[PDB]
Amino acid sequence: IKLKQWTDKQLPNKAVEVAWETLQEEFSRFMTEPKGKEHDDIFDKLKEAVK
């Protein structure tokens, strides 16, 4: 009962939220997190604006 109700009306709605939030978050992280002392932040403003 519970699994069928969730699958029919919930799970396909939670999964897309999880996935698109995950893509947005990892997209943000690749664009902002420095790879140690060699990071160049000159374009960080432009990266954030594009995001």
């Binding site: 420095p34 790879k35 140690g36 002392k37 060699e38």
Partner: protein
């Protein structure tokens, strides 16, 4: 089903919470032992959860201990052996220098590959980066918890301003602030629920 669809939460909360949340964080001042201990408690809890997750991932990634390998015949896979040797490389580095930051040089990745290959371990930059991420997070969190163990009894250093003192207990303030912010956000949401939204729900 219907009653839920006829209710909506007042979106303005997003702005109010923004102010309220800030205020709960804004208190960065642990004035006495009691709040110092509450702060260390929340920091220990939050970091221990992530440390346990990292340790489970590392155990699966590296494989069983020797005791398992001869007592329960939990023989390692080739990937597990490679991961174990790469972990040993990164861990000698961190043991010699606990201050090393998360990010290595790319030539450091090449050096790790070269040493692992020389001993007889097949390794590539991606294996090193994944092993590195998990291992450094484990080192980071366990070092934070040892710093908890030292914060539990650190007050003299700051009375004396002694120059050789490595210990500085500032993560405690962060997790104190976040614990209090969680409390404030939950309470504000409850109040909005119990005085505005729950009566609207009864009407709906």
């Amino acid at each position: 089903e219907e009653s839920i669809k006829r209710h909506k939460w007042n979106d303005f909360a997003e702005d109010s919470l923004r102010v309220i949340q800030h205020n709960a964080l804004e208190d960065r001042s642990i004035s006495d032992k009691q709040q110092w201990d509450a702060a260390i408690y929340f920091m220990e809890e939050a970091l221990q959860a992530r440390l346990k997750d990292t340790e489970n991932a590392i155990e699966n990634m590296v494989g069983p201990d020797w005791k398992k390998r001869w007592l329960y015949w939990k023989n390692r896979t080739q990937e597990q052996c490679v991961h174990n040797e790469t972990k040993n490389e990164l861990e000698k580095m961190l043991k010699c220098n606990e201050e090393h930051p998360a990010y290595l040089a790319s030539d450091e990745i090449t050096t790790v590959r070269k040493n692992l290959e020389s001993r007889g371990v097949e390794v590539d930059p991606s294996l090193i980066k994944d092993t590195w991420h998990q291992v450094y997070r484990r080192h980071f969190l366990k070092t934070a918890l040892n710093h908890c163990n030292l914060c539990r009894r650190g007050f003299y250093y700051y009375q004396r301003h002694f120059v050789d003192s490595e210990l500085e207990c500032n993560d405690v303030v962060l997790f104190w602030r976040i614990q209090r912010m969680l409390a404030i956000t939950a309470n504000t949401l409850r109040q909005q629920l119990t005085n505005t939204e729950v009566r609207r729900l009864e009407k709906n």
